[PDB]
Amino acid sequence: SDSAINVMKWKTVSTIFLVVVLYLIIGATVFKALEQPQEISQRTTIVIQREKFLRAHPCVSDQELDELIQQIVAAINAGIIPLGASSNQVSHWDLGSSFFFAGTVITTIGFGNISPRTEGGKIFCIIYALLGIPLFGFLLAGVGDQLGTIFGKGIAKVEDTFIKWSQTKIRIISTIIFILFGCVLFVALPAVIFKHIEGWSALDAIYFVVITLTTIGFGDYVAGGSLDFYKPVVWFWILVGLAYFAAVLSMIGDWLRVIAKKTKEAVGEFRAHAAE
Amino acid sequence: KWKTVSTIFLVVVLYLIIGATVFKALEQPQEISQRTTIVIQREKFLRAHPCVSDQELDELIQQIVAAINAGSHWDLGSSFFFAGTVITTIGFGNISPRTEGGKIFCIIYALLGIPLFGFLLAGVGDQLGTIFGKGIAKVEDTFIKWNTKIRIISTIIFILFGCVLFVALPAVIFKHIEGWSALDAIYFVVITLTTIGFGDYVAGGSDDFYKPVVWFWILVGLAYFAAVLSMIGDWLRVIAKKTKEAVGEFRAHAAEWTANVT
Ligand SMILES: CCCCCCCO[C@@H]1O[C@H](CO)[C@@H](O)[C@H](O)[C@H]1O
Ligand SMILES: CCCCCCCCCCCCCCCC
Ligand SMILES: CCCCCCCCCCCCCCCC
Ligand SMILES: CCCCCCCCCCCC
Ligand SMILES: CCCCCCCCCCCC
Ligand SMILES: CCCCCCCCCC
Ligand SMILES: CCCCCCCC
Ligand SMILES: CCCCCCCC
Ligand SMILES: CCCCC
Ligand SMILES: [K+]
Ligand SMILES: [K+]
């Protein structure tokens, strides 16, 4: 009964492993069905513009033109805007941007738009993270409980205004108004204000909002690029929005417990009778 | 009634301000070195090739900048690893979806995959947390009866043997493939398994016995830092309670000090 439940646990983990593997295979085929075609469209139309530029200027160093392009791609790893118009440039590690960089590291967002290139900054970032990630975690948990009780007060009013002539079902009305206001306060309202500032689409905003507050942080779209009244309230929104998806992603996990137990007993009965 | 969050808020803001000044002290110098020497190669190129001119180079750069939005990627295996980043919330960003449908799929794929992977990780964490538990049951006998502080010797051997298993040795298997420095490896290892994932260092550059085991290592290494980052939070809880009573005494001894001086 000590190492029995361990045998009962290893069976549980191994099944979840295959669920994730299949889930990754499911997603993979969907992305390469959605992305690999439009890749080859650009892949073949960039070969057009190369042979445009090579024949229009044969006296360019043909075999040493990619060496130019790749040293620009090596320079993509820095925030370059190397041009003849605006040869003068601005720091990407300035007084405010390095503050935002640390904001990504402790939240583990880490967009990657700007990464440290100095061996000193790398060793500092390692220690700054190993200490800042837990530090920020206690802030978030406090903000989560702080916000989780602000929600508790607003629902005490609403769960009286709908008391006509059961508990188990009133709980569902309460969970709706959280996601309702939540996707308004922490999805809708931010994504809209990012649309008039960043000039995105309507999807690019919510895509950004999700990728950011799910602490995935690709860095393809970043809000820190665009008053400077702006960036202080942004990382504040992130703090509370991270606390928001923390509950959202935790609720989705609870739903998947139910769906796992419903489908366990379902196939259990399905295979048990087998004659129906 | 007591918030206690406001005080933690200022600690983080202060901690961000500390880190910020340190980073621009560390990075803004070498930024100027590179960005003044990129202006070097640019006038190098126009002088070494009068064939090319100013009015002919910006259109080359901007179409490379248009290629920044693109770069076979997304192949049979690459899209698998892409999904591996999304559910773990690593998200290097080396390759991101450009299609309107791929974004809407990625949003849903994450909202469902992140919690799903969380149950896998929690099982692997408890699975590994008891594998470690049996190794220390042996060790917490052989020299513990022999001659509060015994906890500390045991906790060292975890970080010791863990930073071997989950930092040292994995960092040196990737030196097989691309080991430039001893720092870039451990920098990569930390940034990866902390789920920060900048993407400046990843295996996708200049790229099948390798990539399957790597994602496996990630699964177990993510569980490793999960405990490591959770232990560090516990020690900070201790250090917070140590420094609470410390100011408690010094503000108390200075209290009736100012009364004794009357
Ligand atoms: C784990 C096996 C231990 C064997 C140690 C051998 C180390 O050599 C490495 O072998 C790699 C081939 O795989 C090459 O790419 C690298 O040139 C080199 O760094
Ligand atoms: C490359 C940066 C390394 C920073 C981490 C230091 C190693 C881990 C600390 C081990 C030092 C001995 C234990 C003393 C208490 C921290
Ligand atoms: C034991 C049955 C394994 C197959 C379960 C269905 C896999 C379909 C993946 C997408 C479903 C996600 C929601 C349900 C999670 C169990
Ligand atoms: C890098 C962080 C340095 C220490 C932060 C200040 C600690 C003193 C404030 C604690 C008040 C209780
Ligand atoms: C070298 C110390 C790095 C900062 C981590 C400890 C700071 C203590 C935080 C104060 C808690 C109230
Ligand atoms: C534009 C698509 C918006 C709907 C995304 C899916 C909603 C999931 C709610 C949890
Ligand atoms: C409660 C947030 C409202 C912010 C509005 C800013 C524009 C006036
Ligand atoms: C966002 C909802 C997608 C619905 C597709 C059909 C589900 C069976
Ligand atoms: C090597 C740089 C360390 C800064 C704390
Ligand atoms: K991330
Ligand atoms: K993360």
Dihedral Cα A58, A60, A62, A63, nearest 10 deg? 160
In order, the DSSP letters of B182-207 are HHHHHHHHHHHHTT---SSS-TTTT-
Rounded Cα distance, A74 and B128, in Å: 40
Phi-psi region of B205 (alpha: psi -120 to 50; beta: other; left: phi over 0): beta
Q: For residues B185 and B173, is the Cβ–Cβ distance under 8 A?
A: no
Cross-chain CB nearest to B114 (options A53, A95, A214): A214
d(CA A211, CA B107): 7
Query: Strands, E, within B100-141: which ranges?
Result: none
Q: Is the Cβ–Cβ distance between B41 and A71 less than 8 Å?
A: yes
What per-residue string of b and e applies to B105-138 under the rule 16 or more CB within 10 Å gives b?
A: bbbebbebbbbbbbbbbebbbbbbeeeeeeeeee
Contact list in B for residue A72 (CB cut-off 8 A) is 61, 64
Question: Nearest chain A Cα to B118, which residue?
Answer: A253
For A31, list phi and psi in degrees, rounded to 5: -70, -50
Question: What's the length of chain B?
Answer: 262
- Short-list A220, A237, A262, CA closest to B96: A220
Ligand 6: residues within 6 Å at CB? Answer: B 104, 107-108, 111
Q: Which of A12, A32, A63 to mutate to test the interface with B (most CBs of B within 10 A)?
A: A32
CA of B179 to the centre of ligand 1 (A): 10
Residue nearest to atom 5 of ligand 9 (CA): A124
Q: A90: which DSSP letter?
A: -
* Ligand 10 midpoint to CA A221 (Å): 13
Of A209, A218, A216, the residue nearest A244 (C-alpha): A209
Neighbour count for residue A29 (Cβ, 10 Å): 14
Question: Rounded to 5 degrees, what angle do the CA atoms A153, A159, A162 make?
Answer: 150
Angstrom distance (rounded) from CA A139 to CA B203: 34
Quick check: A60 and B76 CB within 8 A? no
CA distance B205 to B6: 44
Backbone angles phi, psi at B16, to 5 degrees: -65, -40
Report residue A108: phi and psi, to 5°.
65, 15
Is residue A30 in contact with ligand 3, taking CB distance under 6 Å? no
Q: Which residues contact A29 (CB under 8 A, 6 or more apart)?
A: B79
Nearest ligand by distance to the CA of A127: 2
Sign of CA dihedral B147, B151, B152, B155: positive
Amino acid at A16: I
Which residues on chain A are in Cβ contact (under 8 Å) with B233? 134, 137-138
CA distance B106 to A257: 22
* DSSP3 helix / strand / coil % (chain B, rounded to 5): 80, 0, 20
Q: What is the DSSP string of A235-264?
A: HHHHHHHHHHHHHHHHHHHHHHHHHHHHHH
Q: Give me A9's structure tokens.
A: 């646990």
Nearest to A110 by CA among A205, A207, A216: A216
Q: Sign of the C-alpha dihedral, residues A96, A99, A105, A107?
A: negative
Residue B237, H or E segment:
helix B211-260
Q: Which residues of B touch A49 (CB under 8 A)?
A: 63
Closest CA to A218 of B165, B20, B106, B45: B106
Annotated binding site of A: 108-111, 215-218
Buried/exposed code over B69-89 (b: 16+ C-beta within 10 A; e: otherwise): eeeebbeeebbbbbbbbbbbb
Rounded to whole angstroms, how far apart are CA atoms B73 and A36? 7
As to burial, measured by CB atoms within 10 angstroms (0-12 exposed, 13-18 middle, 19+ buried), residue A183 is middle
Whether A73 is in the pocket of ligand 3, judged by its Cβ within 6 Å, is no
Residues of chain A found within 8 Å of residue B236, distances taken between Cβ atoms: 131, 134-135, 138
Contact present, A223 and A234 (Cβ < 8 Å): yes
> CA A176 → CA A63, A153, A172, A251, B46, distances in Å?
62, 15, 6, 12, 63
- Going from the C-alpha of B5 to that of each of A100, A141, B11, B36, the distances in angstroms are 21, 9, 10, 45
Distances (CA, A) of A121 to A109, A112, B22, B107: 18, 14, 8, 33
- Cβ count within 10 A of residue B210: 12
* CA proximity to A20, closest of B119, B102, B208: B119
Instruction: Quote the CA–CA distance of A116 and A130 in Å, as a whole number.
Output: 16
User: Measured between beta carbons, which residues in chain B are less than 8 angstroms from residue A118?
Assistant: 26-27, 29-30
Cβ burial B160-197 (10 Å sphere, 16+ → b, else e): eebbeebbeebbeebeeeeeeeeebbbbbbbbbbbbbb
State the first-to-last Cα distance of chain A, in angstroms, to the nearest integer. 36
Ligand 9 shell residues, CB under 6 Å: A 120, 123-124
- Give CA–CA dist A133/A143, Å, rounded: 15
> Which residues, 6+ apart, have CB-to-CB distance to B203 below 8 Å?
B174, B177, B178, B210, B211, B214
Does residue A49 contact residue B56 with C-beta atoms inside 8 Å?
A: no
Alpha-carbon B232 to chain mean position: 15
Asked if B236's CB is within 8 angstroms of A116's CB, the reply is no
State the distance between the two ends of chain B, measured CA to CA, in whole angstroms: 36
- Specify binding-site residues of B for K(+): 89-92, 195-198
CA A165 to chain centre: 45
Spatial distance between the Cα atoms of A58 and A44, rounded to a whole number of angstroms: 21
Q: Contact, B195 vs B222, CB < 8 A?
A: yes
- Name which of B9, B12, B46, B180 to mutate to probe chain A: the one with the most chain A Cβ atoms within 10 A of its Cβ: B12
The DSSP code sequence of B29-80 is HHHHHHHHHHHHHHHHHHHH-TTS-HHHHHHHHHHHHHHHTT--TT-TTHHH
Residue B4 has its nearest CB partner, among A49, A87, A142, at: A142
Residue (of A176, A212, A177) closest to A194 by Cα position: A212
Q: Where are the domains of chain B?
A: 1-262
Best of A19, A23, A24 to mutate for ligand 3, by most ligand atoms within 8 A of CB? Answer: A19
What is the experimental resolution, given in Å to one decimal place? 3.6
User: In whole angstroms, what separates CA A143 from the centre of its chain?
Assistant: 20
List alpha helices for A35-118, DSSP H.
36-56, 66-76, 97-107
Q: After which residues is chain B broken (C to N over 2.5 A)?
A: 71, 147, 207
**Structure tokens that stand for A146 in this block:** 């702080």
Contact A133 B8 (CB under 8 A): no
